[PDB]
Design a protein around this ligand. Structure first.
Ligand SMILES: OC[C@@H](O)[C@@H]1O[C@@H](O)C(O)[C@H]1O
Length: 296
């Protein structure tokens, strides 16, 4: 029997809730005992959880690292204990890449690029002021999604990012920050598009846009990432424009790699990429139907 300790970031978004659900169902069908620690969005809580898993002598540790920095000490402890570590859905910045087995993740630069490329085509040379709702400060995915979008719009100077602040990857903070952007930009009239690093923040933004008396999806376009059910519902109501799907099944490939490793010492590739796909309202109904069956 295998026991895996998973240090989870928390439950800040519908996507992460689905990731947790899928981690559980994946573990269950594989006969793996999965212990999930909830970090409540704090790195030090995650480090404490990892230390507990090491002390307990679990067979493997999964970590969704809330931010990219500060993991060397605890990863050295896990390595000294000979407990393999698998990173899910965010990445870390360490010199010693042998401190973990693999990172299962999307290409988050690509995710940002997909939204940026879409926007360039959508506005077709016309002026477009963008407001950006970033993810958690220091999260690899926020850094990368910012970069991908920025690079995609570079040759379209008609597009300008005029506001950018973290919305903590939550609906509530996304709404709060969007409200501040709207008030700072002529009741939202000087805003063409909101780019949110996740769907949840943009769903909060959609509320703020409506409450300001504007039409989300028309007066202010939306581009975001995850493909949570509620973004497709928003698309079907005409209130959201573009979203990049992110599989909630980050745990599956990690379990695959773990099982192979425990069976005969087969090491995984250092980067295990999941597939990213842009979805627009024309496929929203079909994608929404695929979702209650994807962990949501
Ligand atoms: O890999 C994705 C990731 O780490 C992000 O965390 C969640 O907040 C969320 O919705 C999201 O896209």
């Amino acid at each position: 029997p295998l026991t895996v300790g998973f240090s989870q970031v928390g439950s800040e978004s519908g996507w992460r809730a689905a990731e947790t659900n899928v981690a559980k169902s994946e573990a269950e069908k594989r006969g793996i005992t999965l212990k999930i620690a909830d970090g409540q969005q704090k790195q030090e809580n995650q480090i404490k959880a990892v230390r507990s898993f090491v002390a307990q002598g679990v067979d493997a540790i999964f970590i969704a690292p809330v931010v990219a920095t500060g993991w060397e000490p605890v990863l050295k402890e896990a390595k000294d204990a000979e407990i393999p570590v698998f990173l899910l859905d965010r990445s870390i910045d360490v010199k010693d890449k042998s401190l973990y087995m693999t990172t299962v993740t999307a290409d988050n630069i690509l995710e940002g690029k997909l939204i940026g490329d879409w926007l360039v085509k959508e506005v077709n040379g016309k002026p477009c002021n963008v407001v950006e709702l970033q993810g958690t400060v220091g999260a690899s995915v926020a850094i990368d999604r910012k970069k991908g979008f920025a690079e995609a719009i570079k040759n379209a100077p008609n597009i300008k990012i005029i506001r950018s602040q973290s919305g903590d990857f939550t609906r509530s903070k996304g709404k709060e920050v969007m409200e501040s952007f709207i008030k700072a930009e002529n009741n939202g009239k000087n805003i063409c598009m909101v780019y949110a690093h996740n769907d949840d923040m943009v769903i909060g933004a959609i509320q703020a846009i409506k409450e300001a008396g504007l039409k989300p999806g028309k007066d202010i376009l939306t581009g975001s990432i995850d493909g949570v059910p509620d973004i497709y519902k928003a698309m079907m109501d005409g209130e959201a424009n573009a979203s990049v799907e992110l599989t909630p099944n980050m745990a599956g490939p990690a379990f695959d790699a773990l099982e192979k490793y425990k069976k005969d010492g087969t090491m995984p590739e250092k980067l295990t990429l999941t597939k990213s796909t842009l979805y627009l309202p024309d496929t929203a109904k079909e994608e929404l139907e695929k979702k209650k069956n994807m962990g949501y």
